[PDB]
Amino acid sequence: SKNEWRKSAIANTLLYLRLKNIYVSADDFVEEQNVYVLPKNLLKKFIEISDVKIQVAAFIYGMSAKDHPKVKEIKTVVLVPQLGHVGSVQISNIPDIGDLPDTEGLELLGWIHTQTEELKFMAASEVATHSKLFADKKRDCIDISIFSTPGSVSLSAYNLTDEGYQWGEENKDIMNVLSEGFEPTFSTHAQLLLSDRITGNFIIPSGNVWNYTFMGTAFNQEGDYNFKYGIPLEFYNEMHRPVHFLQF
């Protein structure tokens, strides 16, 4: 049937319950390298607006404190026009947010996204997309991968090596079967800390819609889009589905 989504849409209502089980990938703390702090409220919201099956992604912007130049607090999650799939997501370009208020000296720290396959390393659609977005622009951009599954969410932060990037540049496209040249060693654990003592916020497209699944013709993947602070829409929000209200 067409209505695969109906079942998923009902599912996403209970997606808030997955946040009684929040797991963060941890290893030995190294003060020689960075630590990324993700405000807990942003996580809670970002899951609440995600799908159970289809990938959902955003950029993260943040900045260092004075106390420690290596503690990068994430301040803002910028949700942008995009077209999700199972196991991959097509994302529009790094947003221009320069002209918004309170954006004084934010760094683009990277991206954050859902997935339905728990791994210990960045996968091949991840590496393709990570290179697509950041290859020629900002190499240190991390990837925060969220493994979201019934019961729980599990966060995992990665850097990408230059071999990773190069390999990703080679792959303009990714197929289900080809799986050529891939390495789990392409990516490296990055230090992520979830904190509840700082609260971050969202920046959303000005049109308000971030989910161009049911509008896949109008999705401009190099679109010059506008943005504002604001509360992000849910994945199957009526506005992401003009078409279903036409049948009715």
């Binding site: 803002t76 609260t199 971050g200």
Partner: peptide, 8 residues
Amino acid sequence: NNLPPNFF
């Protein structure tokens, strides 16, 4: 104790 960035 920690002001949030903004309200709406």
